[PDB]
């Protein structure tokens, strides 16, 4: 059936994982029958700003390879004026797809994923990137590890079928930090990613993001910035987890906990 050549290396297409804006992802095999994911981007009719954002995303992905194995591997790539191919490490399943099909998450699993997420995001912060759009879909489960897939630089959407890609009703403000919303009139910092990570852990803890129940988007944004609107933190066995969540979801980012401090938190450091 179909092949893709990248830097002269031939890859046969096992299957298509999804589509995007003008994008496709495929599971492929090399000549030794080792599996990879190839992202294809059609550059035809794409503007400098999008090109530049992909160029910049690739440069960062490329550079940060060496710094953390909680970043998706970029084995190789090919860029012309007409297209991009990126040869990347293939995963098992994204975190959102995984969480959506899980009844309840094992406490140990949750903690372990939490550590992976902190480390990946810590890495990008150390190279001056604030992602600013973190959600479960930005993480891929690989060998039982979470790996960050993108840096929020590229104007890309993670792979899905035709109906989802053309669905105007996807794109949540459920993970959006208060300081971004008050920005609207640079409030965004590494603390913004802490809030979003906090919403992911909260989800993995209580089965919903903090404001998921507010269905009107404008109402939801109103609740996110409203200090008087209390976030519920139901008592749970893991008191360290409960604390983490309270520390990540402080509306004032100066009061909000940082990543280096999350990495020294009991929830992360003390076992059983
Ligand atoms: Cl895309
Ligand atoms: Cl629990």
Numbering used by the authors: 515 to 699, 709 to 795
Published text:
Monopolar spindle 1 (Mps1) is a dual‐specificity protein kinase, orchestrating faithful chromosome segregation during mitosis. Mps1 acts as a master conductor of SAC signaling by phosphorylating various kinetochore components. The Mps1 kinase domain adopts the canonical kinase architecture with an N‐terminal lobe connected with a hinge loop to the C‐terminal lobe that contains the catalytic loop, the activation loop, and the P + 1 loop. All reported structures of the Mps1 kinase adopt the hallmarks of an inactive conformation, which includes a mostly disordered activation loop.
To investigate whether the MDS region is interfering with the kinase domain structurally, we then crystallized Mps1400‐808 in the presence of ATP. The crystal structure was determined by molecular replacement, at 2.4 Å resolution. However, the electron density did not show any likely placement for the MDS region, suggesting it is either very flexible or degraded during crystallization. Notably, neither ATP nor its hydrolysis product ADP was observed in the ATP binding pocket. To our surprise however, while inspecting the structure we noticed that unambiguous density was present for residues 670‐685, the activation loop of the Mps1 kinase. The activation loop has a random coil structure except residues 677‐680 that form a single helical turn. It should be noted that the observed conformation of the activation loop is stabilized by crystallographic contacts. However, the observed conformation of the loop, which is affected by crystal contacts, blocks access to the ATP binding pocket, and the kinase remains in the inactive conformation. The conserved acidic residue, Glu 571 in the αC helix, does not form a salt bridge with the catalytic Lys 553, which in turn stabilizes the ATP binding; instead, the backbone nitrogen atoms of activation loop residues, Phe 665, Ile 667, and Ala 668 make a hydrogen bonding network with Glu 571. In the current structure, the hydrophobic R‐spine is disassembled, also suggesting that our structure is in an inactive conformation.
